């Protein structure tokens, strides 16, 4: 949120004439918000339009911005603790199975209208289950990928 | 009789045609035979006896077992004959897997969040 102003002097008023004689569409394109219009604004002062000077190379370098070594790319993750994560996972997704089917059979015996509500209070299953496999199928895809990788590339 | 091993009926119904001689077929038919029954031997067992090998392909005595061991390996010893031994040079072998399996994971993910 930046913005630019200039004064006006009132005696252009006292003749009745405004400022800023006008020849082109481009300065119209936003409006003033309320607040700012219940402070002087045009009875005092007016805006002006801003816009940003660039050139390609400052943007070529910024943008390594939050890019990382090469190693890193090629870690194995530890494979103790990746079992653990998994049948961790594997339990909450049991637990959560053997809640769907209630929802499931619920589907009709209620007023559609009152069926947001229903939401409201209480987690769903359906919503809930899938991000689950999300997680899973992330994970153990490139846990993959990468071992192959490397029992190719070194030796 | 010919889809299975059974070979001790083949050839005895080989003397035995209502027909006629038949020997044109029934010869080529023997031929297929002795050669196949060779290729076969090769593996089943580590050694034979050679009168016991003489006698278990169907010709007798002559210097054609001779020829026929001569036309492959079957290189004699005192009375025996050397098992041909390999059958280890497939196993310990990844670097095939470790490059078909990439692929195979690579096709998992392609059709998995792009819109098909």
Redesign the interface.
Known sequence: VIDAFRLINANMMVLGHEPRQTTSNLGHLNKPSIQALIHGLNRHYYSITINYRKNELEQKMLLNLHKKSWMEGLTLQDYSEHCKHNESVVKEMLELAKNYNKAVEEEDKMTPEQLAIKNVGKQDPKRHLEEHVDVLMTSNIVQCLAAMLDTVVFK | YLMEGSYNKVFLAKGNIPAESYTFFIDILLDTIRDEIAGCIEKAYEKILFTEATRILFFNTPKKMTDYAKKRGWVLGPNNYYSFASQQQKPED??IP??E??KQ??E??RQ?EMIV
Do not use: D, E, F
């Open positions: 990844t670097t470790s490059t399996l990439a994971v690579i998992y993910a998995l």
